[PDB]
Amino acid sequence: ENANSGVISRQFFIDWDKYNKRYSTWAGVSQLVYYPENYIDPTMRIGQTKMMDALLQSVSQSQLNADTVEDAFMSYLTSFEQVANLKVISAYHDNINNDQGLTYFIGLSETDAGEYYWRSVDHSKFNDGKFAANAWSEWHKIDCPI
Amino acid sequence: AAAAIKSRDDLYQYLLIDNQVSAAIKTTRIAEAIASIQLYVNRALENVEENANSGVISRQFFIDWDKYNKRYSTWAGVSQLVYYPENYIDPTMRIGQT
Amino acid sequence: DQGLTYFIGLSETDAGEYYWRSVDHSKFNDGKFAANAWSEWHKIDCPI
Amino acid sequence: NGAQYMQWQSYRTRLNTLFARQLVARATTGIDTILSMETQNIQEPQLGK
Amino acid sequence: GYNNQFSGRASQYVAPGTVSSMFSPAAYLTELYREARNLHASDSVYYLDTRRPDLKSMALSQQNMDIELSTLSLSNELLLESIKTE
Amino acid sequence: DAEKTVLEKSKAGAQSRFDSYGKLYDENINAGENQAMTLRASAAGLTTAVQASRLAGAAADLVPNIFGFAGGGSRWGAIAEATGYVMEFSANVMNTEADKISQSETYRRRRQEWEIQRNNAEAELKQIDAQLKSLAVRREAAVLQK
Amino acid sequence: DAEKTVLEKSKAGAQSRFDSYGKLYDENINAGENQAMTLRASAAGLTT
Amino acid sequence: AVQASRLAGAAADLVPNIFGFAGGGSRWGAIAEATGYVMEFSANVMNTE
Amino acid sequence: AHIRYDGTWNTPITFDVNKKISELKLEKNRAPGLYCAGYQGEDTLLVMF
Amino acid sequence: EQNFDEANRWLKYVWSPSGYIVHGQIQNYQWNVRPLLEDTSWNSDPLDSVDPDAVAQHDPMHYKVSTFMRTLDLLIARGDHAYRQLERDTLNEAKMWYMQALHLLGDKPYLPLSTTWSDPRLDRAADITTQNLTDLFLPQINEVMMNYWQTLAQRVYNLRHNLSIDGQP
After folding, report:
1. CA–CA distance from A110 to each of A10, F82, F86, H18, I16 (Å)?
2. DSSP tag of A102
3. Element of type H or E holding J21
4. Is the CB of residue J57 less than 8 Å from the CB of residue J36?
5. Are H17 and H30 in contact, with CB atoms under 8 Å apart?
6. Cβ pairs A/E, distance under 8 A
7. Do the beta carbons of residue F75 and residue F61 sit within 8 Å?
8. Which of A78, A111, A113 is opposite residue I5, by nearest beta carbon?
9. Contacts by E47-54 with C-beta closer than 8 Å and gap 24+?
10. Nearest residue to D21 (alpha-carbon basis) of C44, A141, I43, I38
11. Interchain CB contact of I38 with C (< 8 Å)
C-alpha cells in the first residue's frame, strides 16, 4: 500500500536496480571499490585521451614487432609533444565570483595556420591551495577555423 | 642456521635441487647443474637473497640476462648468430633497409 | 673532430625535392669514413 | 623563463609545461631514455617571483 | 614478496567465501535487511518484522550459509510453527 | 588382415590431414599476409603529414599575390578549406586503419579454425590406433579359433 | 576393452571440439573486432 | 607519374599570370598543395597495392 | 621548419626579414649570405645575414 | 600476441624486480614511475567511486598491485607456453619460470578459520552496522591473488609429478 517515502529516497534504493537488487552486482561493486586492481584494464580506461585511443587501435593488430611498437610510440610521443607545447592566449571565468565556477582556457599550437584548443578547470574542486588533478580537463581541438 | 631453512621448499630454494620431484623425471647431470645455476642467479638478481655484489650484477652478462643468457637456447642462438651470420640472413627483410 | 654533419640535397626536378643526410665523424678513422657511419637520404615532407 | 601561470590573490597555478621542449634531448637516445627515471625529473622553471 | 610490500591495508583478513567476510552473502543479507526493515511502519500489516518474525531472529553463521536444506521443508517449518502458535 | 590394411589406409589419411593442418597453424601468417599488414598500416601514418602540408599551404595562401594598382587577391577561405581537406582525409585514414584491424582478426579467426581442424584430425588419428589394437586382438582371436 | 578405449578416444575429441567452440562463443567479439567497429563508426560522425 | 605531374603543375603555377598595371597573381601555396595531393594519392596506392 | 619524432616535418614558420635584407645593399640577383648556428647553453638560434 | 620477450621489457619499464642500471651503475629505486615510487602506503581512507581507475589514481598504491599482477600474468604465460611443449629441456624452463613467479609472490599468507566472529543475530548485526559493514564484517584477501598461488602450486605439482599441464599423465 504505502512505502515510507523517506526510506525509498535513500541511496540504497536509488542504487537498487543497478547494484543492490542482485547479490552478484553488489559483491562486484564492493570488490571494485575495495579491490580496484582486479578490474583495471590498461586497454580501455575512462577519461582516456584521444591520442591514447589513437595508440591502442594503432598497436592493436595480429603481429607486433619491436619496430612496429617503436613507431607507434613515436607517433604517440609526437601527439603528446604537440599537445604539450601549446600556449594559453586568453581565458574566461564561468562564475560571478572567483571562488566557485569553472575557468575556460584557449591555447594555440606552435603551427603557422594555428590550431586552437580549449581547456576547462573547476574551482570548486580546488582546495588547500592546490588544484585537484581531476579538476583539470584535457585540451579539446576546435574544429572551426580561427 | 644462517640459512633459515624450514621446509622442503626452503631446502629446494637453498640447495637448488628439487627434492619433492618424483622419480619418473630423468635429466642429465650437466643440464641439472645448469638449472641449479639458473635458479641461483634468478634468486640473486631479484635480490630474494640478501645482497648480491653490485659490481658483478653491473656486468654485461647480467644486463643481457633476461634477453639472452637466462635461457640456454637463446644463448646458443645468439652465439651462432654471431659466429654463423649466414644461417640467420634473410634477403626478404633486413635492418637498415632502404 | 667529433659530432655529426647534416647535409641537404636537391633532386633534379623543377619543383625540387629536398633530402637531408647525416654522417658521423666519430666513426671516421684512419683517413677513411666508415660505411656504416653514413646514413641514407631522407625525404623532407614540408615544402621548400 | 617561459612558464605560464594563472594568478588569483596569493595563489598561482601553472598552465603550460616545458617538459616536452626539454624531452627532445632524451628522445635523441630513444625509448629506453624517454621512460627512464631522470626523464621524470626534468625541472619545471619557477613561475612568478 | 607480495605480503612484505602490499599487506597491511587491513589488520586482519579472512578467507574467500567465509561467513565473516564483508563480501559474503551474509554481509549482503545484513546490509539489505538494515534498509528493508523500515519500508513500512510498524503498525502496518506489511511490516517485515510482523510479516516474517523468525527472519529477524535469524542466526548469521557458516552453518546457515553452507547447509543446503530443502526450501519446502523451511516453508513447512514456518507454516507449522505459526499454526502451532495460533 | 585386409581389414587391417583398410584401417592403416584410414590412418595415413588422418596423418596427412593432421600434419597439413599443423603446417598451416605453425606458420599462420606468411611473408605476404604480414606484408599487407605493414603496407596497410603505413597508410594510417600519413595523417599528420597531410595535416601539416594542408595547414602550411593554407597559411602560405593567405598572403596577397596581386600588387600594383590592384591589391589583395588572397583566398580568405583557405583555412576552412584546409580544415575541410584534413577532416576529409581523416575518414579515409580511419577506414584504412580499421580495415587493417579487421584483416588481422580475420587471420586470427582462421588460425583458430585451424586449431579446430588440427585437433579433430589428431583425435581421429588417435582413435584409429586403438581401432587397430582392437582389430589386432580380434585377428589373433581368429588365430586361436583356427 | 579396446573398443572402450576407441570410444573414449572419440569422446576426448568431441570434448575438445565442444569446449573450443564454446570458447569461440562466449568471447564472440574480442578486443580487436570491436576496435574496428569503434574506428569505423567514428568516421560516420564527421559529416556535421 | 602522378608525383611528377603534380610537381610539374606546381612549378608551372608559381610563375605570374596577370600583367599590366596589376601584377602577380601566382599561387604561392601550389607547392604545399602538390605535396598534399601526392601524399593523398600515396595512401590510395598503398591500399590498392 | 623542424622534424618530428615520427619523421614528419612541422609547418614552416615565416619570419619577416624585409628590413634586414634592405639593410644589406645586395647586388642585383645575388643571394644574401645566411649564417645559422645553434648555441651552447643558451637555447637560441643565431640567424645572421 | 605471445611476444613475451618484448612484453617483458615494456612491462619492465614501469617496474622491474631485478633493478635499474643507468650509466652502468645500479639504481637504488625499484619503480620507475615517480608517483608509484613516492606513494608507499594507502591513504587513510579510499576514494568512494564506482570507477576503478579514479580510485586507483587517488591511491596509486593500487597501480603498483596492478603492475605486480601483470608481472605474474606474464611469468605464468611464459611458463605455460614452455609447459605446452613436452620435451624434457623445455619443461625445466617451465619450472624455472614458475619458480621465478613463485618467489615473487612469496609466502602465501596463513589465515586462521577460528575467529572472534560470534555468529550474531541478523537483528543485532544490523543494529551494529546501522551507524553512519566493517563494524562487524572483516575484509577478505583478494581472491585473484589467492588464485595465483592456487594455479602456481597446482602447475608445479604437475611439473613435479610428470603430468601434463591439464593433469593428463
Report:
1. 52, 17, 18, 35, 17
2. E
3. strand J21-22
4. no
5. no
6. 28
7. yes
8. A78
9. E54/E78, E54/E81
10. I43
11. no
Bridge partner residues of C4 (DSSP): C24
In total, the C-beta contacts within 8 angstroms joining chain D to chain J are 15
Report the DSSP beta bridge partners of residue A120: A104
Indicate the residue of H28, H39, H47 with minimum beta-carbon distance to F60.
H28
- Give the up-direction half-sphere exposure of residue J65: CA atoms within 13 A in the CB hemisphere: 27
Contact C13 H32 (CB under 8 A): no
Q: Which three cell numbers stand for residue A100?
A: 566557485
Interatomic CA distance for residues J138 and J168, integer angstroms? 39
Interruptions in chain D after residues (C–N over 2.5 Å):
none
Instruction: Tell whether the torsion through CA atoms of B48, B53, B54 and B58 is positive or negative.
Output: negative
Long-range contacts of range A18-21, CB-CB < 8 Å, 24 or more positions apart? A20/E32
* Contact assessment for residue J50 and residue A15, using Cβ atoms and an 8 Å cutoff: no
Nearest to A75 among F45, F60, F87 (CB): F45
What residues pair up with C6 in beta bridges, in sequence order? C22
Residue of A nearest to G38 (CA): A57
What per-residue string of b and e applies to A8-45 under the rule 16 or more CB within 10 Å gives b?
Answer: eeeeebeeeeebbeeeeebbeebbbbbbbbbebeeeeb
**Contact with chain G for residue A57, Cβ under 8 A:** yes
CA distances from E42 to A3, A4, E38, J45, J164 (A): 12, 11, 8, 37, 63
* Max CA pair span of chain J: 66
Resolution in Å, one decimal place: 2.9
Measured distance CA(A109)–CA(F145) in Å, rounded: 96
The C-alpha cell 566493517 sits at: J134
Q: A3 vs E39: CB contact, 8 Å cut-off?
A: yes
Cβ-based neighbours of J136, under 8 Å, separated by 6 or more: E30, J120, J125, J128, J129
CB A95 within 8 A of CB A102: yes
Residue type, C30: D
J139 touches chain E (CB under 8 A): yes
Cα dihedral A65/A71/A76/A79 (nearest 10)? -170
**Cross-chain Cβ contact J138/E57 below 8 Å:** no
Contacts of J125 (CB under 8 A, 6+ apart): E30, E60, J136
Chain G partners within 8 Å of F133 (Cβ) = 2, 5
Virtual CA dihedral for F92, F98, F103, F104, nearest 10 degrees? 140
CA distance H11 to H30: 8
Q: Which of B82, D40, B74, E35 is nearest to A16 (CA)?
A: E35
For A126, list phi and psi in degrees, rounded to 5: -70, 130
Tell me which residue in A39, A47, A69 faces J52 most closely, judged by beta carbons.
A39
Place of cell 647525416: C22
Assess contact for J90 and B32: CB atoms under 8 A: no
